[PDB]
Amino acid sequence: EQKIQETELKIRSKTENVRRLEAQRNALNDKVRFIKDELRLLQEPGSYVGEVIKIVSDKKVLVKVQPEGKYIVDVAKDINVKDLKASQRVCLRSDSYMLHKVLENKADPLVSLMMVEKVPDSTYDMVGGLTKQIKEIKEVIELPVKHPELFESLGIAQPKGVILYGPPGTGKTLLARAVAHHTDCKFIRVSGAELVQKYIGEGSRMVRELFVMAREHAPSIIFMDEIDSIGSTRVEGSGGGDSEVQRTMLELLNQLDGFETSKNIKIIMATNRLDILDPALLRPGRIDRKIEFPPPSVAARAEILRIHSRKMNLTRGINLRKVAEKMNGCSGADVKGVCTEAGMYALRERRIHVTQEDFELAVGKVMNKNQET
Amino acid sequence: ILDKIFYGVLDQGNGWLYVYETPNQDATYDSALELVGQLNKVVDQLFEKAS
């Protein structure tokens, strides 16, 4: 019976070769599904996005089309007609001009610098160094945003806005990204240049885009430009730019508390003087708390020099407190400038570390540079 | 010639001279630089997925 058992050896021997066939079969099925998806996707005429207006008991629906207008389409067989609500984001096919699919509900209009980000790159260590600067942020921002029940338990409102102060050369612009990064919130930057155009309605629609976006995205942080006088990013306002859109902007921002009644919305604004804007902004709901940048004294700038020394390479025997006593009213821009000057003398010496002799030459240059104008 | 300015070799015994072209080779072994860097990393990462 060994002759038959020897023939059985071919079954187990060729079985290992059969297993190689299973390797090419799965690789072949991936190519079949790939080519099959080519004819389906490439022949699609395309589909746009529209908002649901109202539902009809006749198994139709009215969807507003941006390039066209309100047009009644037919509800798809896999889509519920009753699940469609007002201003619901759905997908409509451009061929038959009917309903195609349903997307997730969110506000996504034309985006110019309006894109909502999450935890950008910033830290309290680089833009910090002052005790009162960070402490006032915790009370005005960190407490009401993270724990809104603190003010609600006492039956009092919580600040939704802040006005930044202090002499020029603060650096609070990058600090705004640290507020959204450490609090795990969403950063929203509002640039008045992209939201104001000569076309009719741009000073309105672009502002209403922020109004509709802030409804669902309310747990976020908003930062507005063009008003900032504090010296970090300073346009010193606009005489003719803020003389027109001021009417279609500030009225829609106050409707958040009056109409939307949405919380956890932080409006970060900065100005050194109130001139071209509304003198009535001092009312609650717009300007609540005011954080002033303390003067860069010796004790305040002593820790600021310790900020760069962590990233910078320094030698031994350097006194960071004595350097702070050598100047007067040194802003945040001049600190980064004198550290840049100190790195220039190190390149001439071909040393990766900045010797104490280079600092005395760098401090002498920044004092005469800051004295002019 | 010691500083690689002029390309050539002389003969001190017979007072002769020879022809020396500037390129002595081309790019061949340079492909092993990407080969040695791959087998010292990719191979080590394969042991991590096994355990």
């Binding site: 072949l28 996707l41 390039p67 | -």
Partner: protein, 125 residues
Amino acid sequence: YFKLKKLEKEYELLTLQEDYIKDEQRHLKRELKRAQEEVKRIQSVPLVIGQFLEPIDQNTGIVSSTTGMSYVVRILSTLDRELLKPSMSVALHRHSNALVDILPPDSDSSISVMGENEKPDVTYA
């Protein structure tokens, strides 16, 4: 006696699967042939301009063309997450409406013209 019959029944699988291995290789050559033909239909001669907005699924995305009407195109297999720009002006197809290539944000237009020099001839120092 069933031991002899159960063995001969297993060679029927071994009979077809020997020549079926090379059938997949010849089919793979046809799949690679069709793969090169599908790439040509994505771009070829016709091309248009479109603005990317948001994706949905692999090889699927929502864009905005020049005419203003949005269309669902087929995202290139190379662009997935990091390589795919969240908002960028890209190239599309006229009819089939498929993604083509990422176009650079050209600042040259008829309004707000900013000049640019290419290889100045002035010698340094």
